[PDB]
Design a protein around this ligand. Structure first.
Ligand SMILES: Cn1nc(C(=O)O)c2c1-c1nc(Nc3ccccc3)ncc1CC2
Lengths: 258, 297
């Protein structure tokens, strides 16, 4: 466990409060809706599996999208253009080897031009004012994972899975901070795999108590329970892979006994 | 955006980077021009990373990004202007040497810039003398973040995006999976020594040559010195077993404290390699001051 570890957590907490999108932006959108967003994000997950992109990439794109939508009206037919540019930008930021523009135009199935996509990359950069280094649920999970005394790979996969699920549903998750969704995802996974609970070390590190996490935890548990019934399924499919130890097939606890 | 560009007078190329003046305020700046139509793949990944990370780092020892101008064909980064880079300065100092007090001042400041980077989860990854900028007041600053990476999530090692060979850390050469903040400390250590001796510490001709030059000076690492070395991808059990050179012979002009700090910056196991944060606490900097360079400008 590194020693800039603590400085960095503190900094990420500082930052996650600034990169924050408007929680109610969606009812101010004339033409798009949570459902449409869910479809878009689930699609991005697919794209990520196709191009073997990192989870951090996916998380960053969703951030960019939610922030762009907090201040720009977008029409149904353009929503995917925004998501594509967002995915491309997140790839450039995070990936070692970002797919080329062409590949991104390919997966929109020639709905859009190389020109449109690059023009939208520009617009998103303007709107987001080049601030692409956003804190993610992914990042905080990574921090939290070091305080995992018995380090357990199923716990990590399941937490990754739960955190990724929260990307899909703007309601309720748009109203929690990444550090908090992370805390819920870590505990819920840890509780499901090993029956252990949100550890003392992390309470000290984060200042979050199981009590403070409860409201989000309740939501995340609900999402976890309903996951097989959800209209968007790409994440569950992804987390059936051996790479994730098939954790999306694990049965969620019936009660959190909080 | 085109109005903003009209406000700049180009003075001269310094790097492409131009020294430039603000016609309205008189401010002197460095413009880094980036042509976009030379690739047709959008804003480059280096630019994305440099801008986003750099504008997050305000520190006296990190080059200040003043502005970004993004037209349709051109992208400009506007930086504060400094007078020269350390590589040129070291060149100019060949006959005389750089005064130990100035070397200390510089290493001290560099560690402060680097410490600030790392505590904001940025790896520089390309620390070498020409990427370090100095002014007439005796300040020195980290610059060129084209290869810089945020490591909120661990950063994977990439074959093509690597620091130039002479300052490349042994973990990287032996083929480690991830970068850590330690690769930056290594490069600094290398630069520290070079300022002291007037020669590059490890001027390798190739990856394997670079590695051996390090082994010849610091000894060939083993499981005791560095648990895991023998397991690393590009480690060969058929490496020659060199012994660790006496350090006072490697950096003769350095006192005990200086030898101490340098050897901790060059420790083989990246887990044990000293941090910028901790290096700053070292008794070596007990008496640090801020000399001004003789810049032959
Ligand atoms: C050259 N260069 N490359 C980059 C970059 O980001 O690649 C940068 C600079 C630079 N050089 C100088 N001053 C200077 C003056 C004379 C000689 C050398 C340097 N001052 C500011 C900058 C900002 C970033």
């Amino acid at each position: 466990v590194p020693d800039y570890h603590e400085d960095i957590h503190t900094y990420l907490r500082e930052m996650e409060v600034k990169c924050k999108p408007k929680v109610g932006y969606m009812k101010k959108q004339p033409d798009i809706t949570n459902s449409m967003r869910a479809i878009l994000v689930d699609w991005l997950v697919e794209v990520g599996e196709e191009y073997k992109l990192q989870n951090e990439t996916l998380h960053l794109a969703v951030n960019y999208i939610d922030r762009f939508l907090s201040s720009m009206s977008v029409l149904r037919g353009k929503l995917q253009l925004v998501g594509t540019a967002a995915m491309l930008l997140a790839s450039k930021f995070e990936e070692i080897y970002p797919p080329e523009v062409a590949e991104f135009v390919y997966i929109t199935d020639d709905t859009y031009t190389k020109k449109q996509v690059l023009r939208m990359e520009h617009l998103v950069l303007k709107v987001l004012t080049f601030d692409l280094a956003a804190p993610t649920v992914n990042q905080f999970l990574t921090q939290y994972f070091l305080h995992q005394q018995p380090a357990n790979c199923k716990v990590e996969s399941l937490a990754m899975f739960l955190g990724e699920l929260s990307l899909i549903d703007a309601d309720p998750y748009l109203k929690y901070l990444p550090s908090v969704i992370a805390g819920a995802a870590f505990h819920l996974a840890l509780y499901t795999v090993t029956g252990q609970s949100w550890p003392e070390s992390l309470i000290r590190k984060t200042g979050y108590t199981l009590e403070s996490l409860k409201p989000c935890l309740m939501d995340l548990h609900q999402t976890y329970l309903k996951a097989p019934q959800h209209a968007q399924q790409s994440i569950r499919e992804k987390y059936k892979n051996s790479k994730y130890h098939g954790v999306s097939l694990l049965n969620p606890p019936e009660t959190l006994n909080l | 955006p085109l109005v903003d560009m009209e406000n700049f007078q180009k003075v001269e190329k310094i790097g492409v980077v131009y020294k430039a003046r603000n016609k309205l305020t008189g401010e002197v700046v460095a413009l880094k021009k980036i042509r976009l139509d030379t690739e047709t793949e959008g804003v480059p990944s280096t630019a994305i990373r440099e801008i986003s990370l750099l504008k997050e780092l305000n520190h006296p020892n990190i080059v200040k990004l003043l502005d970004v101008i993004h037209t349709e064909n051109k992208l400009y980064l506007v930086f504060e202007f400094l007078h020269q880079d350390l590589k040129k300065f070291m060149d100019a100092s060949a006959l005389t040497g750089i005064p130990l007090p100035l070397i200390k001042s510089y290493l001290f400041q560099l560690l402060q810039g680097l410490a600030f980077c790392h505590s904001h989860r940025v790896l520089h990854r390309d620390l070498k003398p020409q990427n370090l900028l100095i002014n007439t007041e005796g300040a020195i600053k980290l610059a060129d973040f084209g290869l810089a990476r945020a490591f909120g999530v661990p950063v994977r090692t990439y074959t093509h995006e690597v620091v130039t060979l002479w300052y490349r850390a042994p973990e990287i050469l032996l083929g480690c999976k991830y970068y850590s903040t330690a690769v930056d400390i290594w490069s600094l250590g290398c630069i520290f020594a070079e300022m002291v001796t007037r020669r590059a510490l490890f001027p390798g001709d190739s990856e394997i040559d670079q590695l051996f030059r390090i082994f010849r000076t610091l000894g060939t690492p083993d499981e005791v010195v560095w648990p895991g070395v023998t397991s690393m991808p590009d480690y060969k059990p058929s490496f020659p077993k060199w012994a660790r050179q006496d350090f006072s012979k490697v950096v003769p002009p350095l006192d005990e404290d200086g030898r101490s700090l340098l050897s901790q910056m060059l420790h083989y196991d990246p887990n044990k390699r000293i941090s910028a944060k901790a290096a700053l606490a070292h008794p070596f900097f007990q008496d640090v001051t801020k000399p001004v360079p003789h810049l032959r400008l």
